[PDB]
Design a protein around this ligand. Structure first.
Ligand SMILES: COc1ccc(-c2ccc3[nH]c(=O)c4nnn(-c5ccc(N6CCNCC6)c(C(F)(F)F)c5)c4c3c2)cn1
Ligand SMILES: COc1ccc(-c2ccc3[nH]c(=O)c4nnn(-c5ccc(N6CCNCC6)c(C(F)(F)F)c5)c4c3c2)cn1
Lengths: 286, 300
């Protein structure tokens, strides 16, 4: 774990100005950055930001200027989170999600958490989609957590960063021995039904998104592109997830079952409404 | 096939409908005062227009303890795109819906001469502001990749034009593979799908949703790819899993529907990398241009 690097308020203002300019521009010219930040002082700051790899300079035939980098975007989110006493130090990357990088972080007291940094996207698409990708995850984690789903407890959010409870477990893909394979297989299958019961289909249900703890309990850590059960082709997505689970257990643990669930028999009984509500609340702030 | 020309709308009404769209970019719900400012009608019958737009179900109004205002509806968003396409002579009439994509509704449309095309209307974002942007983005990505894939001789429809969340493309004379119950040579059709997966992987892409619903079969039993919403790069950390999943879906369908099995299915290791500037790079270039042109970035 390493403490965040120091930065002056002036440098932070320019870095923030690059981000603001990037909302509607693929490339931000030095002149615009100066206008937003409020000019050979500005150029000094830009030169320092390039050296630190927080921003990058680019030349194209139509326009030339700067853009935020992954590191620069990360710094904005982490500093904001640092200011809220949520994250003070960041460790190394332990893995990835479909659209994200996962890290370990610690607060002031040294209490550890999981940090997910979302990367999705074009420069303007990248800034917008990464932020949106994170918001959706935080919103859905919160909604799923309220209904006692096996997901981490969400702690905080900013931009493309999400901070959640850290599960003491490993991805199912790295697990080669389990106490009872039928037991874990059933937990996963029951999980798929429970999501369908609440109107959701994962769409990426696999050994990579499922984490197994010491007690062999499964926790869902990635849900980027879930499908509604109201979708015209919802059955196919449901069946695909089930087959993926069956495939993995046959390959890894040599376990088979003929009790595969069916989509039509699934009934409904709400997370999407709550999650959309949470998404709307968060959007008001940004 | 019932194709109907769009209903007429006055310049004033279109201006207000356009104003709601502009307002929706910064507001989940758009207040009336803001719409008037944006529309700026010379004589100020703004409230008159909005209620008619509400009556025609093009927009909807809401009040909450915290906020109140208007929002575009699916029909209203559709009207802006179609009216725009109509003025540019791309499409004059719209038929019935013939099917769906992962994030879209597919329709039949016709131009002035009565020539038919396929129209896709993208719906994504079930928040109001995300709905406005994501639908545009979904349409833009689709047009951009269709263009990039088509120029490289991929079996995809020819993209004609786009606006907002709408994409207009060549209409393929075929039906989705899920609806096909008899084929002259299933082995041959199976080969087309597998070759398509290899060709996409060779160009740095994995479909991620490769299925009977996304593949169209024509009169000569040729396959066309009509929906590719969330493709994965071959450089993705778990790309091999996604590649295999798509292959298994194809194998599964053919065993169930045609009782056909084969052992000549591709492997991820065999994939090659062509020119660095491949489909993704070309598609990204198109995406940047369309984003620059987006009407939200310019005055009315
Ligand atoms: C929400 O909590 C979590 C916990 C673990 C993970 C996660 C996700 C994908 C991973 N992919 C890998 O290839 C991998 N290799 N080691 N590894 C992993 C798993 C658990 C853990 N620990 C988690 C905290 N208790 C000690 C074990 C570590 C760590 F020790 F480095 F922190 C690394 C992962 C991984 C973890 C995600 N969220
Ligand atoms: C890009 O070109 C196309 C063409 C067809 C399609 C498409 C996609 C999903 C569909 N799902 C359905 O349940 C369905 N039922 N009929 N139907 C269909 C297929 C081909 C066609 N035609 C295509 C043009 N020549 C005459 C047949 C029609 C039409 F009669 F309405 F034009 C309807 C579809 C469908 C088409 C998509 N893109």
């Amino acid at each position: 774990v390493a403490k965040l690097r120091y930065m002056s308020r002036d440098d932070f203002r320019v870095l923030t100005a690059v981000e603001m300019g990037m909302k509607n521009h693929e490339i931000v010219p030095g002149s615009l950055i100066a206008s937003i930040a409020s000019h050979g002082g500005c150029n000094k700051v830009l030169r320092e930001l390039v050296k630190h790899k927080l921003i990058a300079w680019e030349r194209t035939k139509t326009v030339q200027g700067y853009r935020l980098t992954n590191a620069g975007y990360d710094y904005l989110a982490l500093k904001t989170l640092s200011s809220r006493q949520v994250v003070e130090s960041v460790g190394n990357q332990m893995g990835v999600g479909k659209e994200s990088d996962i890290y370990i972080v610690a607060n002031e007291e040294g209490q550890q958490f999981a940090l997910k940094l979302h990367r999705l996207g074009h420069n303007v698409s990248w800034l917008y989609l990464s932020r949106l990708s994170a918001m959706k995850e935080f919103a859905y984690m919160k909604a799923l957590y309220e209904r006692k789903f096996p997901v981490p407890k969400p702690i905080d959010y900013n931009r493309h960063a999400v901070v959640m409870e850290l599960i003491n477990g490993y991805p199912l893909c790295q697990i080669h021995h389990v106490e009872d394979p039928a037991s874990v297989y059933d937990e996963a299958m029951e999980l798929i039904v429970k999501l369908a019961n609440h109107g959701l289909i994962h769409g990426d249900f696999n050994e990579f998104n499922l984490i197994l703890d010491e007690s062999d309990h499964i926790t869902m850590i990635d849900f980027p592109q879930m499908v509604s059960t109201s979708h015209p082709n919802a059955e196919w997505y449901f069946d695909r997830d089930v087959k993926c689970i069956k495939d993995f257990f046959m390959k890894r643990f040599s376990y088979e079952s003929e009790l595969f669930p069916t989509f039509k028999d699934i009934r409904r009984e709400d997370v999407e409404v709550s999650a959309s509500g949470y998404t709307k609340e968060m959007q008001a702030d940004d």
